[PDB]
């Protein structure tokens, strides 16, 4: 399938993101340097090329956004079938030591998904699945500025700012969480947990339908919060008074 | 001095350079794309350095955000009189052909330049200047996600994902705009003009205070309609009629 093939993709043999730095021209190599910004796009980069060739290997149409900030990063879709469509949205994170709890953002809870055309590609019915391609990576310090070039020969030699990467797979309503993110609070906070859970998919809601469900009547204000639910426990429990 | 220096030490570096892809560990180098989520973030990682060796140089302290989403891209200082800051951010932006009218996004106008405290690394009011450290790159061919792997000894036949880059140093209410930007259009558009005038500091408002006042009473709009203003005329007028 679409969906194996690009877990392939990614996944064990030869996938290796083993960075170094930006080469030049004249041959010189400028290392990273430390910084969470600069890491992500790399990966969204390394992503653009596997995702074009799985594909477009199930004859697939790969379709990336033209306008700011419009959900969702890849579209993948047939012509001839224009309501089967697809969406990936690659997501980055890194922790502070190696196996320590792991947690994204995963876009906004009041745009396309109140609004079936707010800021999104295409109509936000005419997509079956919106999958997440997580990239995790262990921080390495952070040291400071650079100017330090280095050559083909000192390839060993050069510092990473990042250590262990991991990358899953998974249906977006399956790793989603219960808490608005930190820092806008407009878009949703994914589960808090070991990389592990993401790829298990062990979540919080029950279906993609109480993800929904959740999501489209979560209350954007405080002390309103507290009039409906705040997390899983009171969502079920409003859901047992009457929805009111 | 150190808009000087500054300015002098961004034409010689950032000239020469010509970087054309990403090299791994392996020795395997993974080309660009002429993205401006790839080239901006190269920018970035080029300039930091060279701001500081040269704050440095003056005797400034840099900073930098702690937090992510915060402005200014760097904070600089004398300890000699630490309420006089200057504000550099970096912007990038390309061009299809040479030569022609190029525009940019400055920021945001509803956090700090509304609030003096919203998401800026120190109180507005400390700032005593916002430079703008501007990067044009010349766009080239978009052919395919050819992220094809390439070895050292293949560099010039890798691919560019530009060829051409000037540079300039302005300050923000300069080169500042009356309209919102592309995507994210809770943004402040830079004026609609030639590389030159960026240069030259040709802008549309009469100063800097003429500036604020557009952008603080600027108005949230779906759709223009506005029975304010949507432009500098417009504004100009509502202050000879009353600031209703």
Do not use: M
């Given at each position: 399938?679409?969906?194996?093939?690009?877990?392939?993709?990614?996944?064990?043999?030869?996938?290796?993101?083993?960075?170094?730095?930006?080469?030049?021209?004249?041959?010189?190599?400028?290392?990273?340097?430390?910084?969470?910004?600069?890491?992500?796009?790399?990966?969204?980069?390394?992503?653009?090329?596997?995702?074009?060739?799985?594909?477009?290997?199930?004859?697939?149409?790969?379709?990336?956004?033209?306008?700011?900030?419009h959900y969702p990063?890849?579209?993948?879709?047939?012509?001839?079938?224009?309501?089967?469509?697809?969406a990936?949205d690659?997501?980055?994170?890194?922790?502070?030591?190696?196996?320590?709890?792991?947690?994204?953002?995963?876009g906004?809870?009041?745009?396309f998904?109140?609004?079936?055309?707010?800021n999104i590609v295409?109509?936000?019915?005419?997509?079956?699945?919106?999958?997440?391609?997580?990239?995790?990576?262990?921080?390495?310090?952070?040291?400071?500025?650079?100017?330090?070039?280095?050559?083909?020969?000192?390839?060993?030699?050069?510092?990473?700012?990042?250590?262990?990467?991991?990358?899953?797979?998974?249906?977006?309503?399956?790793?989603?969480?219960?808490?608005?993110?930190?820092?806008?609070?407009?878009?949703?906070?994914?589960?808090?947990?070991?990389?592990?859970?993401?790829?298990?998919?062990?979540?919080?809601?029950?279906?993609?339908?109480?993800?929904?469900?959740?999501?489209?009547?979560?209350?954007?204000?405080?002390?309103?919060?507290?009039?409906?639910?705040?997390?899983?426990?009171?969502?079920?429990?409003?859901?047992?008074?009457?929805?009111?």
């Open positions: 399938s679409l969906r194996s093939d690009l877990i392939n993709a990614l996944y064990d043999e030869n996938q290796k993101y083993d960075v170094c730095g930006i080469i030049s021209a004249e041959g010189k190599i400028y290392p990273l340097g430390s910084d969470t910004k600069v890491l992500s796009t790399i990966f969204e980069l390394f992503s653009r090329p596997i995702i074009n060739k799985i594909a477009e290997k199930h004859g697939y149409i790969v379709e990336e956004p033209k306008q700011q900030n990063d890849f579209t993948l879709y047939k012509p001839s079938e224009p309501n089967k469509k697809i990936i690659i997501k980055t994170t890194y922790t502070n030591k190696e196996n320590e709890k792991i947690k994204f953002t995963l906004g809870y009041t745009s998904i109140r609004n079936n055309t707010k295409y109509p936000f019915d005419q997509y079956i699945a919106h999958w997440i391609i997580g990239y995790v990576y262990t921080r390495v310090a952070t040291r400071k500025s650079s100017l330090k070039t280095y050559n083909i020969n000192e390839l060993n030699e050069i510092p990473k700012p990042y250590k262990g990467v991991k990358v899953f797979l998974q249906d977006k309503w399956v790793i989603a969480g219960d808490l608005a993110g930190s820092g806008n609070t407009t878009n949703i906070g994914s589960i808090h947990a070991h990389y592990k859970d993401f790829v298990e998919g062990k979540g919080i809601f029950d279906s993609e339908d109480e993800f929904l469900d959740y999501w489209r009547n979560y209350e954007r204000t405080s002390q309103l919060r507290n009039d409906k639910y705040n997390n899983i426990s009171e969502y079920r429990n409003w859901i047992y008074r009457g929805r009111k």
